[PDB]
Amino acid sequence: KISGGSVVEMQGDEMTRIIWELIKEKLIFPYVELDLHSYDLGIENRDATNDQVTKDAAEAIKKHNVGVKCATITPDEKRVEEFKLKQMWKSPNGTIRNILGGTVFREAIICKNIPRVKPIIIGHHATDFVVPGPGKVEITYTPSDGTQKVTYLVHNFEEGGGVAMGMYNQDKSIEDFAHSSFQMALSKGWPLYLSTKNTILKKYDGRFKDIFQEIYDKQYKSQFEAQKIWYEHRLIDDMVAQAMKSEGGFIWACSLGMMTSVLVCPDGKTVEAEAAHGTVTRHYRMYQKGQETSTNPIASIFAWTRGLAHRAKLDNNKELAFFANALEEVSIETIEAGFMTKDLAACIKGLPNVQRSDYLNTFEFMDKLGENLKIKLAQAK
Amino acid sequence: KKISGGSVVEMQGDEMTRIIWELIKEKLIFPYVELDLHSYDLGIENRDATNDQVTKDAAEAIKKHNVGVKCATITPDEKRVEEFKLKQMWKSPNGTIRNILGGTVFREAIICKNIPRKPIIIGHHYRATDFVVPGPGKVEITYTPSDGTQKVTYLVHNFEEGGGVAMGMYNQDKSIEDFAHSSFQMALSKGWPLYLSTKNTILKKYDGRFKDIFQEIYDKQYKSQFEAQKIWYEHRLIDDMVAQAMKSEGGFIWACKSLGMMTSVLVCPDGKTVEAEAAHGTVTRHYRMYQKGQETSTNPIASIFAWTRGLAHRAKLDNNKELAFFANALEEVSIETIEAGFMTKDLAACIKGLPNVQRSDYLNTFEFMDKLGENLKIKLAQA
Ligand SMILES: NC(=O)c1ccc[n+]([C@@H]2O[C@H](COP(=O)([O-])OP(=O)(O)OC[C@H]3O[C@@H](n4cnc5c(N)ncnc54)[C@H](OP(=O)(O)O)[C@@H]3O)[C@@H](O)[C@H]2O)c1
Ligand SMILES: NC(=O)c1ccc[n+]([C@@H]2O[C@H](COP(=O)([O-])OP(=O)(O)OC[C@H]3O[C@@H](n4cnc5c(N)ncnc54)[C@H](OP(=O)(O)O)[C@@H]3O)[C@@H](O)[C@H]2O)c1
Ligand SMILES: CN1C(=O)/C(=C/c2ccc(=O)n(Cc3ccccc3)c2)NC1=S
Ligand SMILES: CN1C(=O)/C(=C/c2ccc(=O)n(Cc3ccccc3)c2)NC1=S
């Protein structure tokens, strides 16, 4: 078996919990041995430990660089009542993000037989108050050296009351955004585009464009030209214009079962992968009632494969990297071959025309991925 | 022999929308409706010659006669000033007319049963003071009452690490009240429910002000009439609102904090004044193809529906059931004509995919307008 390494695993809730254990059992463990740092982020254990499993998991990701997370219930009122929660805990994704930092990149997985060639990887990057009555709401900046004092008028209230707010943004955040954007662009080998309003908010987004150019020229221009890739700034409307008439395959800096979300830290060494969808509670209820479900596992599978690909990149693990690539291959090939779940069958033929004989249920699709994975790993090597 | 329309303010535009405009009137509106027409030529040449005075006059005429219908007008930039030898770079007519009439903009997409996906109407409530921070310092925001009361200073941020950027935003109470009013007026006009989505938790005081004002206006004015129509209002949050929206049959008005089918309507808070216009521009590419003598295929549905929304509002005001039925008949003739298979190149592309658009799949502009004239005559003959 392949020697994997140190990987932080986080288990989730409901249907994604089931698919998680299936993915490991039938796809991961039979071929890879891992120094696994498992953390049970189910809602009942998060309640029992008072989100301490969440904090611990986040710090463990900070130590071992690579994390793979399953979808976990985010509690609201009906959740607190359902599980008898001691408190309405904050989102574990929120906690982990507030401990690790970084920027989130969402990539959709494109099959050549599903209605939509190269995927677009989209990455996204305050004092409010009431104002009782008429008056002057100004915003003033005073440098630390006291050289000047600049005061702008947000609005002069003469009609009556209202509401106001002020926002800020330091340079280091924009520099981290550009860092992770260029690193992701070089890791995938696809060009990078930055889209902003830039004209409406003249001063605000122009800073983003400028910092992106400074970092690109002082660090990445050479390596980009050395990989048939580049960076370029555009505006939102023109970005949609060229986008709706392009082959695809670029990092744009601004069925759900196929969306993959990955948090990339600015230092470039720490990465957390997770499906972009939720716990699929409706299908989990169908599973509780003994009915037949059909949940696409591709998003969580790709969380595992991207996490393993990053672990392999860190450990110089050629075998494990080949394994992750092989599993992604088996997935896209299995769907393109015709075997898929009901959601993809609906994306193709439209819901009211979906016959049963057009899709497989969750366990059948997992079995098919297992067969094709064993075949692929035996023949491709 | 023709329907008595009423007082309507017309605004003429530029280029391809100008051509399609004259086609819509000549072949669809005038043969069946007589109007006390307040025409205003908002073309770039007349706006230049009169020094944008025709824009102010047209806006004031809409404020007086309640119903306005506008054609797409060029908003001039540098290449426009260079093209027309403009004396000045005039402001956007939508900007002027909107700053004189107030109100809230509602955009509705027209859904055909053969178009890649009940319609959803989205009304939107810009002036933000942003600046760059060069180095360390204190960025504060201060409110000072008019009655000489103590001034309250909040710290937006203290920069000690280095530079950055900052900005400030505001919103008066009257603006939020106009937004909620126009939202309720549109909700009762369409008979669909109304939803308000905000970041009520992150911006507690800011969006909480919106939620509160919306609820207060709902209770001390409406709610009774909503219950009198099997409809309601409800505040929600962004993500759950997208959840309910993206998984419903459609048919609700969402208040937020293909272009040939998009219709834009400015609704004033008073509920009487309404200005309708297509959500697209003057279609310069098609107008240049039209100048060179080439064959164009520009969808007129958006402008036609501008006319039908304006006329339907005029009929609703004057209690003109005949004119209201005419507007409904024209809307239905449009959607039915497209669903019958006759359409323009953009819709043919939405159906058959762009690289596979064969000519025999669409009609040119004049052919499609002729078809709408035929089907309008037939339907109005059957009624
Ligand atoms: N990191 C996390 O733990 C995390 C992040 C996101 C969401 N969530 C949690 O998920 C819970 C419920 O989420 P939700 O109600 O919004 O549903 P969801 O999981 O976000 O997805 C909603 C829809 O996705 C569809 N779906 C079908 N197959 C799927 C597949 N293989 N993968 C993903 N989605 C599939 C279902 O459509 P059908 O109607 O046809 O069944 C379902 O209605 C929430 O408590 C939320 O906190 C967890
Ligand atoms: N913001 C506005 O919409 C607005 C408001 C009032 C007046 N105007 C004025 O109208 C004038 C003409 O500008 P405009 O052509 O942009 O008006 P427009 O009405 O917004 O034009 C839309 C057109 O853009 C074209 N297009 C070309 N490539 C595209 C792509 N990759 N993605 C999406 N659409 C694409 C389409 O025509 P094809 O079928 O040929 O591709 C489409 O009909 C301007 O001077 C403007 O000031 C515009
Ligand atoms: C899908 N998804 C997110 O993208 C996410 C991130 C996030 C980060 C911070 C935060 O405050 N929230 C909102 C929240 C507040 C309190 C309790 C629970 C959630 C959410 N949480 C989830 S579920
Ligand atoms: C497409 N499109 C609009 O939808 C639009 C609306 C609008 C409404 C209010 C307003 O104050 N402005 C500001 C403005 C003033 C002068 C020139 C340009 C913009 C613009 N202006 C345009 S061009």
mmCIF file of N, CA and C in Angstrom, chain A residues 168-172, chain B residues 135-137 157-164:
data_model
loop_
_atom_site.group_PDB
_atom_site.id
_atom_site.type_symbol
_atom_site.label_atom_id
_atom_site.label_comp_id
_atom_site.label_asym_id
_atom_site.label_seq_id
_atom_site.Cartn_x
_atom_site.Cartn_y
_atom_site.Cartn_z
ATOM 1 N N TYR A 168 -12.754 49.505 6.232
ATOM 2 C CA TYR A 168 -11.320 49.643 6.035
ATOM 3 C C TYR A 168 -10.769 48.361 5.429
ATOM 4 N N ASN A 169 -9.482 48.406 5.082
ATOM 5 C CA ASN A 169 -8.764 47.251 4.555
ATOM 6 C C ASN A 169 -7.265 47.519 4.505
ATOM 7 N N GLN A 170 -6.474 46.728 5.223
ATOM 8 C CA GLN A 170 -5.035 46.945 5.248
ATOM 9 C C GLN A 170 -4.361 46.258 4.063
ATOM 10 N N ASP A 171 -3.113 46.664 3.810
ATOM 11 C CA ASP A 171 -2.383 46.167 2.647
ATOM 12 C C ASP A 171 -2.097 44.676 2.754
ATOM 13 N N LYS A 172 -1.755 44.196 3.954
ATOM 14 C CA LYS A 172 -1.322 42.809 4.095
ATOM 15 C C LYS A 172 -2.398 41.832 3.639
ATOM 16 N N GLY B 135 -0.217 55.478 4.738
ATOM 17 C CA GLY B 135 0.549 54.849 5.788
ATOM 18 C C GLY B 135 -0.203 54.748 7.100
ATOM 19 N N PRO B 136 0.522 54.443 8.179
ATOM 20 C CA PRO B 136 -0.123 54.301 9.491
ATOM 21 C C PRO B 136 -0.824 55.578 9.932
ATOM 22 N N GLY B 137 -1.831 55.406 10.777
ATOM 23 C CA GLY B 137 -2.627 56.517 11.256
ATOM 24 C C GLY B 137 -3.965 56.010 11.756
ATOM 25 N N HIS B 157 -10.670 52.182 11.917
ATOM 26 C CA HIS B 157 -9.516 51.334 12.208
ATOM 27 C C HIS B 157 -8.299 52.191 12.515
ATOM 28 N N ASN B 158 -7.429 51.649 13.365
ATOM 29 C CA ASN B 158 -6.122 52.228 13.637
ATOM 30 C C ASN B 158 -5.075 51.408 12.890
ATOM 31 N N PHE B 159 -4.485 52.007 11.861
ATOM 32 C CA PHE B 159 -3.412 51.395 11.090
ATOM 33 C C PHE B 159 -2.093 51.607 11.826
ATOM 34 N N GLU B 160 -1.500 50.516 12.316
ATOM 35 C CA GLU B 160 -0.133 50.536 12.813
ATOM 36 C C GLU B 160 0.803 49.690 11.971
ATOM 37 N N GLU B 161 0.272 48.694 11.259
ATOM 38 C CA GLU B 161 1.097 47.836 10.417
ATOM 39 C C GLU B 161 1.537 48.558 9.148
ATOM 40 N N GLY B 162 0.674 49.404 8.592
ATOM 41 C CA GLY B 162 1.015 50.110 7.366
ATOM 42 C C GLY B 162 -0.191 50.804 6.769
ATOM 43 N N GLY B 163 -0.198 50.886 5.443
ATOM 44 C CA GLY B 163 -1.264 51.554 4.726
ATOM 45 C C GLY B 163 -2.464 50.663 4.471
ATOM 46 N N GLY B 164 -3.352 51.164 3.609
ATOM 47 C CA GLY B 164 -4.541 50.433 3.219
ATOM 48 C C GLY B 164 -5.528 51.254 2.413
#
